[PDB]
Structure 1
Amino acid sequence: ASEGPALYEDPPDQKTSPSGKPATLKICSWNVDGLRAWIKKKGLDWVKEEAPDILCLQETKCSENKLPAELQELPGLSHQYWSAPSDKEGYSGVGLLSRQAPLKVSYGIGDEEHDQEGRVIVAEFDSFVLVTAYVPNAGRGLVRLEYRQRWDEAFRKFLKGLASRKPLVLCGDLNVAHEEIDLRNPKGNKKNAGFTPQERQGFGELLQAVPLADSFRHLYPNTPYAYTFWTYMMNARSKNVGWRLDYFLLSHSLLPALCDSKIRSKALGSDHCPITLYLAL
């Protein structure tokens, strides 16, 4: 009620690094709010335009056994990996689609308690490891906040482990707006899922412990009104009343390779928009 529109125009794509090296890897991440719903809403149209080397999808709500045939319309992303809840129902779920086959693909974070909801794919490449995640929501009434804190700890320890061996890129819907600048209405959301002190602190703990850098915020430290999620309700997207919940977090060693971290604000198909990373590896 107190918010009107706040303008945000994502800056032009910077496709060369600070050292002059052209980007060699383009990764797009997108919480699609259901694979089938997204396809119906022409989500694949942005994918074809974006032409990433790797596409990471969250909330597919679909298992590897029941994928829509349309996913074959991505010939440039022929290596496709999917994780879904082990109860085999239609919720959560992540996907990773890649131009080249990774050296190894794994699922989950090595902890049975946290591996039953189809939330994580790990794809190891030559010079880096890519993780995509759909982090557990703290829930209406914060009924899942206690679980979320357990998840956060287990996830951080798992990622720290990976990073000790190879440079890490983590992407996906991390279900937290880190700082006040990361959502339109900080004051009124401090007791809501995605902006609790607990969740924000978990994010800070992740950055410190692994350690990892927030690619977007690294490049645009003072830029407000840059969001990746808007509730379907109340004309939130038209007014840009949103939250930045979707990130690319990078090992510090990858910062010299960082060209840009984009927010594709105008791409429709979900209640989240895509984010896109350019790296010169």
Structure 2
Amino acid sequence: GPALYEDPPDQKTSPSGKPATLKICSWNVDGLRAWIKKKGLDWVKEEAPDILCLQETKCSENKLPAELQELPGLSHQYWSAPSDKEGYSGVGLLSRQCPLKVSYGIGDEEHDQEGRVIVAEFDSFVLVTAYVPNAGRGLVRLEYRQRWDEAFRKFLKGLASRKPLVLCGDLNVAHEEIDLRNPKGNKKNAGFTPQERQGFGELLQAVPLADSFRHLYPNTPYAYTFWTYMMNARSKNVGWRLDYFLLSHSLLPALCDSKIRSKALGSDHCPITLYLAL
């Protein structure tokens, strides 16, 4: 039999006893246009998050499906696309409330050409959504990835030093062996090289940040957010945990639950959802 997983019910209450006031949802959608045809928007309508983060939109602003302008709950929409590479990468952030402040990229030209990061600053925290560069098949871009990890870390430490930080999206690492079905077989595969894993480790420590889902569920295995379309990986739960909500430690008294919407379809990733009591 296969090692399967069932996300526990939503716990909508903080340790202090306080109820959740903010629901954030994050989803690598493997193409916004395709995802919307596969009815990803109707799932979002039902989860009704206050904030929705989208990675790999692979879509410029002038080709956004009109369904997005039929979202009364998420009226403030920000999109970033690559400078020159069409139909590649791309990130979006949708919000009920208008952020105090929004900006794009991590303040470093070399790393700001592929539309990977949006920063939205609110009252009590700063939200960053990101689609981290893949090291690629053959690890052809592993060296650049290392360069990214450093620049990204420095940048996030900067934000965090001024306000509590929430970082979500596809960080493109399975941190520990427990974060993917087949650890030994992928030790030289993008997403689970020693360099990427140690990069994620150094990110948690240096910023600093806490991995919300693993903070709440330290020993819960077989919890994944990505399955390759190939070889029926998903039905056999052969997956990776590549999508995170990383929190500033000052926010952990506000954390109610960090979820994995395993059953939501439309992409090779599934959505994740964060509950905070603010």
Q: TM-score range by the shorter chain?
A: over 0.9
Cα separation, 2, equivalents of 1:99 and 1:142? 39
Cα separation, 1, equivalents of 2:137 and 2:85? 24
Q: Do the aligned partners of 1:130 and 1:169 also contact (CA within 8 Å) in 2?
A: yes
- Measured against aligned partners, the alpha-carbon deviations of 1:112-141 in whole angstroms (never above 9, x if no partner) come to 000000000000001000000000000010
Structure 1 residue ranges, 4+ long, deviating more than 3 angstroms after superposition: none
Q: Select between 197-206 and 86-95 the one with higher mean Cα deviation.
A: 86-95
Give 1:194's aligned residue.
Answer: 191
Q: Do the aligned partners of 1:30 and 1:56 also contact (CA within 8 Å) in 2?
A: yes
**C-alpha deviation, 1:183, in angstroms:** 0.1
- Measured against aligned partners, the alpha-carbon deviations of 1:126-165 in whole angstroms (never above 9, x if no partner) come to 1000000000000010000000000000000000000000
- 3-state DSSP of counterpart to 2:178: helix
- 3-state DSSP of counterpart to 1:152: helix
Q: Select between 51-60 and 66-75 the one with higher mean Cα deviation.
A: 66-75
Q: Do the aligned partners of 2:85 and 2:114 also contact (CA within 8 Å) in 1?
A: no
**C-alpha deviation, 1:64, in angstroms:** 2.1
Give 1:94's aligned residue.
Answer: 91
Give 1:148's aligned residue.
Answer: 145
- Measured against aligned partners, the alpha-carbon deviations of 1:54-97 in whole angstroms (never above 9, x if no partner) come to 00000000122321111112110000000000115111000000
- 3-state DSSP of counterpart to 2:230: coil
Q: Does 1:248 align with 2:245?
A: yes
**C-alpha deviation, 1:261, in angstroms:** 0.1
Could you state the TM-score of these two structures normalised by the residue count of structure 2?
Answer: 0.99
Cα separation, 2, equivalents of 1:140 and 1:101? 39
* Percentage of matched positions with identical amino acids: 100
**C-alpha deviation, 1:102, in angstroms:** 0.3
Cα separation, 2, equivalents of 1:214 and 1:65? 35
Cα separation, 2, equivalents of 1:37 and 1:63? 14
Runs of 5+ unmatched residues, structure 2: none
Q: Select between 264-273 and 82-91 the one with higher mean Cα deviation.
A: 82-91
**C-alpha deviation, 1:5, in angstroms:** 2.2
Give 2:52's aligned residue.
Answer: 55
Cα separation, 1, equivalents of 2:60 and 2:81? 5
Cα separation, 1, equivalents of 2:99 and 2:224? 30
Cα separation, 2, equivalents of 1:187 and 1:73? 46
Cα separation, 2, equivalents of 1:114 and 1:75? 33
- 3-state DSSP of counterpart to 2:135: coil
Give 1:206's aligned residue.
Answer: 203
**C-alpha deviation, 1:239, in angstroms:** 0.2
- Measured against aligned partners, the alpha-carbon deviations of 1:16-39 in whole angstroms (never above 9, x if no partner) come to 101111100000000000001101
Q: Do the aligned partners of 1:5 and 1:241 also contact (CA within 8 Å) in 2?
A: no
Runs of 5+ unmatched residues, structure 1: none
**C-alpha deviation, 1:201, in angstroms:** 0.2
Q: Does 1:109 align with 2:106?
A: yes
- Measured against aligned partners, the alpha-carbon deviations of 1:202-245 in whole angstroms (never above 9, x if no partner) come to 00000000000000000000000000000000010000000000
Give 1:185's aligned residue.
Answer: 182
- Measured against aligned partners, the alpha-carbon deviations of 1:231-280 in whole angstroms (never above 9, x if no partner) come to 00001000000000000000000000000000000000000000000000
CA distance 1:88–1:66, change in 2 (3 Å): farther
Cα separation, 2, equivalents of 1:94 and 1:24? 25
- 3-state DSSP of counterpart to 1:29: strand
Q: Do the aligned partners of 1:5 and 1:238 also contact (CA within 8 Å) in 2?
A: no
- 3-state DSSP of counterpart to 1:240: coil
